[PDB]
Paper text:
Thiolases are a ubiquitous group of enzymes that are involved in biosynthetic and degradative pathways of lipid metabolism. In the last step of the β-oxidation pathway, degradative thiolases catalyze the shortening of the fatty acid chains by degrading 3-keto acyl CoA to form acetyl CoA and a shortened acyl CoA species. The protein encoded by one of the [name] thiolase-like genes (the thiolase-like protein type-1, MsTLP1) was over expressed in E. coli, purified and crystallized. A detailed analysis of the structure and biochemical properties of this protein revealed that its fold agrees with that of classical thiolase, but the nucleophilic active site cysteine and other characteristic thiolase sequence fingerprints are not conserved.
The crystal structure of MsTLP1 was determined using the single wavelength anomalous dispersion (SAD) method. The final R-factor and R-free of the refinement at 2.7 Å resolution are 23.3% and 26.1%, respectively. The polypeptide folds into two distinct domains: an N-terminal thiolase like domain (residues 1–407) and an additional C-terminal domain (residues 435–507), with a 27 residue long linker connecting the two domains. Thus, the N-terminal domain is organized into a five layered α/β/α/β/α structure characteristic of the thiolase superfamily. The C-terminal extra domain (residues 435–507) is made up of 6 β strands and resembles a barrel-like structure with three anti-parallel β-strands on either side of the barrel. Electron density is missing for four segments consisting of residues 17–25, 64–77, 135–170 and 253–254 in the thiolase domain as well as for the N-terminal hexa histidine tag. The six protomers in the asymmetric unit are related by a nearly perfect non-crystallographic 32 symmetry. Therefore, the hexameric state observed in the crystal structure of MsTLP1 is likely to be the result of crystal packing. Static Light Scattering (SLS) and size exclusion chromatography experiments show that, unlike other thiolases, MsTLP1 is a monomer of 56 kDa in solution. The most significant difference is that the active site nucleophilic cysteine, Cys89 of the CXS motif of Z. ramigera thiolase, has been replaced by Gly102 in MsTLP1.
Residue numbers in the entry: 2 to 17, 26 to 63, 78 to 133, 168 to 252, 255 to 507
The structure:
Amino acid sequence: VDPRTPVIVGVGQFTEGMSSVELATEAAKAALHDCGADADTVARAIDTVAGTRQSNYPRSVARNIGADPAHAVLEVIGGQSPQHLATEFGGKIAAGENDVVLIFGSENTSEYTIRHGLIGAPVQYGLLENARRARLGLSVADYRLAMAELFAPFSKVAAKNPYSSAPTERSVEELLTVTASNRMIVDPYPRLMVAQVNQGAALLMMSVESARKLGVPEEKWVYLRGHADMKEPKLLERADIGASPASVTAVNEALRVAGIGLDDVAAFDLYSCFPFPVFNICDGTGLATDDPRGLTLTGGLPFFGGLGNNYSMHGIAEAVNEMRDKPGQFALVGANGGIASKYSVGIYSTEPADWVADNSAQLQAEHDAQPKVAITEKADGTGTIETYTVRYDWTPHTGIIIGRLDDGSRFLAKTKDEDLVKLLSEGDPIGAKIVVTPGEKSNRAVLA
């Protein structure tokens, strides 16, 4: 190795009401202890703290652990951020920038798409998920089975994870069967498949030179062997609403950087608030959904607990532990990412190497050069349903549609028409003809 090469040396998790500072503090204290050196000496050596977004929250965490770092960072929103952050400080440790960095996050118990209803995460993921159902040509009930078969192995791992907050294990049948208890929320998801905790996570990272200076046992060092960060264009510009090629590209580029192939990976933690971003990696990569290696280390999002923002740092922590236990093997972490907007991948191993710079910037500019699908904001005429969702938590039930015209440009529409909503809830709408009427609040729709 080169002395500037970055290693993860300490990881920390905590579950418990404590403040969000207090929770990140508890996890940070465990990261400092995990490294096997004197915590206080390590704390004095920290030059940067970075926190994920939930006052100076990163400096309060620092004061609490005995650190006085020159830089404090408050990162941008999104589930990609823990892994984006680890990659960014890896790179800066590799150059002449930083030497000891602490990353942490926590959570407490306490445009033209906006005006159409796309405000929360679930309704928007519904559209992507129904778009993937279109491309695969699966029926509604068939797809619902696929989702339950993907997620049941998740909740099993989740139930044996002590860091999981109040988890019950669920069978495939239990997830797929609509009851008064497991009722339809947003199409196509039943309640048990989408669902508040106290938890903190921290990562301690260093140059190999700082690890020796500070007295950190070598059996604790883990390398970030591969990495990539990718980004999609806004939802209605995407070539296929049912896929995210940027996520797959990130995975493949991170694989290249490590010098390995998909078969060489021993363990996966794939980000899973909804089935889609998991499915999507599987579709573009060849990885089977029932792969014996497993697709989660943590148990995943519905089941593990949490809002979604700081989830992947628990992933990274589990990856790092699992890799110390199986020295020489490789672990992939995937972090999502808005409305499948962002994806960040890290591959971890005890096997040493020099930091390899990734090709994300040039891969991003290639994907940015792809043609964008055209949008008609004020659509007036006859169109085809490309994808849809329904809000079952509203009365009357409310449909959101992305459509196509004859022109081939996309639009959005909202609908409470009793006739149309019956087709979206109880049948198979893809491709059905509808008539859309413009309006500056929402475009409305009805059958043809």
